[PDB]
Amino acid sequence: VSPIIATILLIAITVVLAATLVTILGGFTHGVSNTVETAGVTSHITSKYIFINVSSSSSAISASSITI
Amino acid sequence: VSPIIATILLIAITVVLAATLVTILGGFTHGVSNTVETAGVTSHITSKYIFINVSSSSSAISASSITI
Ligand SMILES: *[C@@H]1O[C@H](CO)[C@H](O)[C@H](O[C@@H]2O[C@H](CO)[C@@H](O[C@@H]3O[C@H](CS(=O)(=O)O)[C@H](O)[C@H](O[C@H]4O[C@H](CO[C@H]5O[C@H](CO)[C@@H](O)[C@H](O)[C@@H]5O)[C@@H](O)[C@H](O[C@H]5O[C@H](CO)[C@@H](O)[C@H](O)[C@@H]5O)[C@@H]4O)[C@H]3O[C@@H]3O[C@H]([C@H](O)CO)[C@H](O)[C@H](O)[C@H]3O)[C@H](O)[C@H]2O)[C@H]1O
């Protein structure tokens, strides 16, 4: 009797460890993305205005997505 | 006479112990199953909506079986 019952208990424990491991991995598998951008920019500053002129960029992006 | 009668009584007792043991074992031999699942999930949160996008999963499961 007892060696089979001990085996059933060890299977039950194994499933909870595997379920625990899955929640540990979730802390690694997020928030990685390609955020690199590169632009040819020139600028001139005066007592009233900053002028900004763009010559090229790595990608086309919305002017609302850029913070100054 | 008496050694045979004593033997018949011990057989009767033995059956009730075996029947008792069978009901003890029934508390072990249930409720063990493979419950592990694992998914590639990404999400974005706003003042009005949560977006959830799934990239892969360990198995195909009903959206009614998942609790949020
Ligand atoms: C999962 O997989 C999916 C599918 O591939 C997606 O890839 C998802 O990624 C998310 O997608 C959503 C939806 O595309 C993204 O939400 C958008 O976020 C942008 C910000 S961003 O910097 O431009 O990238 C915008 O906020 C966009 O909103 C648009 O709609 C706004 C509201 O317009 C709605 O209502 C008007 C009426 O008032 C309607 O006429 C119109 O048709 C529409 O229904 C606009 O205001 C907005 O304009 C400006 O928005 C931002 C400032 O907020 C600015 O930066 C922009 O340049 C632009 O000038 C823009 O046109 C979001 O889209 C969703 O739109 C719904 C709407 O119901 C239509 O479906 C909501 O109302 C919200 O507006 C918004 O959720 C999200 O960023 C991605 O992560 C993957 O995760």
Side-chain angles (χ1 to χ4, degrees):
Chain A
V1 175
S2 74
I4 295 156
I5 286 170
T7 296
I8 293 166
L9 295 172
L10 289 167
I11 292 161
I13 292 164
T14 296
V15 172
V16 176
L17 294 170
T20 299
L21 172 66
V22 165
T23 71
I24 296 168
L25 308 196
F28 295 87
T29 67
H30 84 292
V32 180
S33 64
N34 178 15
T35 61
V36 183
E37 178 48 56
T38 306
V41 182
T42 62
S43 184
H44 179 64
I45 304 179
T46 66
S47 59
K48 293 178 185 287
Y49 298 104
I50 302 174
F51 304 98
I52 311 170
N53 292 337
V54 183
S55 66
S56 57
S57 66
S58 190
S59 70
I61 64 183
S62 177
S64 65
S65 303
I66 298 166
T67 300
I68 179 170
Chain B
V1 177
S2 74
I4 296 157
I5 286 173
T7 296
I8 293 166
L9 294 172
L10 289 167
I11 292 161
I13 292 164
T14 295
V15 172
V16 176
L17 294 170
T20 299
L21 173 65
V22 165
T23 71
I24 296 168
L25 308 196
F28 295 87
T29 66
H30 84 292
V32 180
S33 64
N34 178 16
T35 61
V36 183
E37 179 48 56
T38 306
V41 182
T42 62
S43 184
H44 179 64
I45 304 180
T46 67
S47 59
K48 293 178 184 287
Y49 298 104
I50 302 174
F51 304 98
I52 311 170
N53 292 337
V54 183
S55 66
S56 57
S57 66
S58 190
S59 70
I61 64 183
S62 177
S64 65
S65 303
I66 299 166
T67 300
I68 179 169

